Amino acid sequence: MRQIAIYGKGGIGKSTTTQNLTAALSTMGNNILLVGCDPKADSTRMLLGGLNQKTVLDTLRSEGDEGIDLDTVLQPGFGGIKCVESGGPEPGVGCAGRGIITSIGLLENLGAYTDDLDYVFYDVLGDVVCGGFAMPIREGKAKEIYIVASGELMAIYAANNICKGLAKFAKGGARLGGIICNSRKVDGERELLEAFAKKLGSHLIHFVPRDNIVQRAEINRKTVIDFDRESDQAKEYLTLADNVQNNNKLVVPTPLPMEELEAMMVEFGIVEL
Amino acid sequence: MRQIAIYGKGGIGKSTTTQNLTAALSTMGNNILLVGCDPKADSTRMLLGGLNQKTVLDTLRSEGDEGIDLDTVLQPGFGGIKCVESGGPEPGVGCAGRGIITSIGLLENLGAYTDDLDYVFYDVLGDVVCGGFAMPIREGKAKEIYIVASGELMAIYAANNICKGLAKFAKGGARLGGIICNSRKVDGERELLEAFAKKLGSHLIHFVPRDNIVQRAEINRKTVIDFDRESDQAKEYLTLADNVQNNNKLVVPTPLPMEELEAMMVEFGIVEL
Numbered sequence: 001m002r003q004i005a006i007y008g009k010g011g012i013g014k015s016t017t018t019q020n021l022t023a024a025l026s027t028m029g030n031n032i033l034l035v036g037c038d039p040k041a042d043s044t045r046m047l048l049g050g051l052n053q054k055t056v057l058d059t060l061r062s063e064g065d066e067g068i069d070l071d072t073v074l075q076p077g078f079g080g081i082k083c084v085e086s087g088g089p090e091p092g093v094g095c096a097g098r099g100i101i102t103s104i105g106l107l108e109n110l111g112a113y114t115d116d117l118d119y120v121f122y123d124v125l126g127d128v129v130c131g132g133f134a135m136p137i138r139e140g141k142a143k144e145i146y147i148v149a150s151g152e153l154m155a156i157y158a159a160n161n162i163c164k165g166l167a168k169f170a171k172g173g174a175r176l177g178g179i180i181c182n183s184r185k186v187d188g189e190r191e192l193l194e195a196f197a198k199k200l201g202s203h204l205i206h207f208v209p210r211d212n213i214v215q216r217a218e219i220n221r222k223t224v225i226d227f228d229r230e231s232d233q234a235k236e237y238l239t240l241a242d243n244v245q246n247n248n249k250l251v252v253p254t255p256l257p258m259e260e261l262e263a264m265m266v267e268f269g270i271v272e273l
Numbered sequence: 274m275r276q277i278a279i280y281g282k283g284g285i286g287k288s289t290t291t292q293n294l295t296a297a298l299s300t301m302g303n304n305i306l307l308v309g310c311d312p313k314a315d316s317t318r319m320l321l322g323g324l325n326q327k328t329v330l331d332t333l334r335s336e337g338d339e340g341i342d343l344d345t346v347l348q349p350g351f352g353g354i355k356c357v358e359s360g361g362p363e364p365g366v367g368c369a370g371r372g373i374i375t376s377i378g379l380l381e382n383l384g385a386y387t388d389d390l391d392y393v394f395y396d397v398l399g400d401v402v403c404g405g406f407a408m409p410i411r412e413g414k415a416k417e418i419y420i421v422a423s424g425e426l427m428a429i430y431a432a433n434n435i436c437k438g439l440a441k442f443a444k445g446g447a448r449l450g451g452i453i454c455n456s457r458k459v460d461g462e463r464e465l466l467e468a469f470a471k472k473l474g475s476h477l478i479h480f481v482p483r484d485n486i487v488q489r490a491e492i493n494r495k496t497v498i499d500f501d502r503e504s505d506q507a508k509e510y511l512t513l514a515d516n517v518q519n520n521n522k523l524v525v526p527t528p529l530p531m532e533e534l535e536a537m538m539v540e541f542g543i544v545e546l
C-alpha cells in the first residue's frame with residue numbers, strides 16, 4: 001500500500017487537486033483511502049457529493065456512549081474511494097496532532113486499512129509546520145509526500161518549511177515525492193516552480209493549469225474526472241496521477257537557505273526591488 | 274491602548290488587510306505595534322519593504338552570552354509602525370503557540386508595550402483553531418478580534434470556528450469586533466457576509482474590494498496607502514480604519530449551527546443543489 005500525504009499552503013486549491021488526483025487514480029483500477037487531515041478544507045466533498053461529511057472527531061465527541069461504526073465515518077465516493085474526515089481540534093483548546101493520531105488510531109481499529117488498498121492519501125494542512133500537523137510523517141503513516149505550491153511568495157515559503165520538517169524524519173523513511181504546481185496564472189510560474197523543485201533535489205511532477213471547468217465541476221459537487229472524463233483538465237489530472245503512480249524519484253529534500261530562497265523570488269519577479 | 278488580533282482563513286488576503294489597515298491607521302495619528310503570529314504570512318514586509326524580518330524566535334536561538342536588543346526584533350516601518358515577527362515553530366517539532374507565548378513575553382520584558390502606543394495588532398493564523406493559535410486570546414493579550422472572510426464556504430466555516438474559540442474565552446474579556454470581507458468578486462458576497470455577521474451577533478465592518486492596485490503595491494513591497502495615498506482602494510482601507518477605530522460594538526459571538534451555516538450557503542447560491 002502506498003502511503004501518501006499532500007501538504008501545502010491553504011487557499012491555492014490543494015484539496016481540489018488531491019480529490020482530482022485520487023479520482024483520476026481510481027480510474028486506473030486502484031483502491032484508495034482518503035483521510036482529510038485539514039480542519040479548514042472539505043477534503044472529500046467533490047468525491048462524496050455532500051457538504052462536510054461527519055468527521056471522526058465530531059462523532060467521537062458527540063452525545064452518547066455507543067461505539068463508532070465504520071460506516072458512520074467512512075463513506076464510499078467516486079471511484080470507490082473510501083472517504084474520511086478526521087475533524088478539527090476542540091476550538092481554542094485541542095491540538096490537531098492528537099486529533100489526527102486519534103482518528104487514525106480509531107480507523108485502524110475499525111479496519112479501514114483493508115488489505116486490498118493500493119493507496120492511502122492524507123490531505124494535511126500546511127499553513128503551520130508544527131509538531132501536530134507533522135504527526136502523519138513522524139509516525140510513519142505517510143511516507144511519500146507531495147507539496148502543492150504556486151508562484152506566490154508565501155506558497156513557496158510554506159513548501160520550503162514543509163521540506164524542513166520532512167527532512168527531520170528522513171531516517172524513518174519519509175521522502176519528498178515532488179512538487180505540484182496549482183497554476184495561479186503568474187508569469188513564469190512553471191519556470192519558477194521547476195527551479196524551486198530542482199534546488200530541493202526534487203522535481204515538478206506536474207503543472208496543473210487554471211481551467212474554468214474545475215469551478216464548473218465543483219459547482220456540480222464533483223471532481224473534473226467525474227464531471228467530464230474526456231475533458232482536457234481531466235487529462236491533466238490523469239497525467240498527474242500517472243506521474244505519481246510511477247514516481248521513482250523520491251528524495252530527502254534539501255530546503256533552500258533563506259538567501260537563496262529570497263534570491264529566487266527576485267530572479268522570477270515574484271517581488272520587485 | 275487597543276489590543277486587536279486579526280484572524281481568518283489563509284489565502285484570502287488577511288495579512289494584506291492587516292498591513293493595509295495598520296498603515297491606514299498610522300496616517301490617522303496612531304502609534305501602532307504589529308506582531309506577526311502567522312507562520313505562512315510575511316505580516317510586516319509591506320510596512321518594512323524587505324522580506325522575512327528577523328524573528329523573535331530566531332533571535333533567541335542565536336542568542337549569545339549577552340541578552341537581546343529590542344531593535345533586533347522590533348523594527349520601525351511605514352507610518353512609524355513597530356513591526357515584530359514571532360516566527361513559526363521548529364518545522365515538524367514545535368508548537369506554534371509556545372513561540373507566540375514566548376515572543377509576546379519577550380516583547381513585554383524588553384519594554385515594547387510603551388505608554389504611548391495606541392494599538393497593538395496581532396496577525397494570527399486562523400486555518401486551525403487549536404489551543405496554540407488561541408493563545409493571544411486565552412492569555413488576555415488580544416481583547417478585540419476581527420475576522421477576515423470571503424463569500425466562500427470554508428472561509429465562513431473557518432470564521433465560525435474562530436468564533437467558537439472566542440466565545441469559549443469570553444470571561445477572559447475577548448470580544449468579536451466584526452467581520453471584514455475580502456471580496457472574491459463573487460455574486461451577493463456582501464449580502465452573504467452581512468447575513469453571516471448578523472447571525473453571529475456582530476456586523477460587517479467593511480467590504481474590501483478586489484483591486485489590482487493591491488497586487489501592484491505588494492509586488493513593490495508596499496501597502497496601498499503607501500503605494501498610492503490618493504488611490505481608490507487606499508480610501509477603502511481608510512474607511513475600514515475609521516470603522517475599526519470608532520467601532521463600539523464588541524460582542525460575544527453566537528456561532529452558527531452547522532445546518533444553519535450550510536443553509537446560508539444554499540440561500541445565497543454559494544452551494545447549488
Ligand code: SF4
Pocket residue numbers: 094095096097128130131132133367368369370401403404405406
Ligand atoms: S502543535 Fe500545532 S496543532 Fe497542536 S496546538 Fe500547537 S500549533 Fe496547534
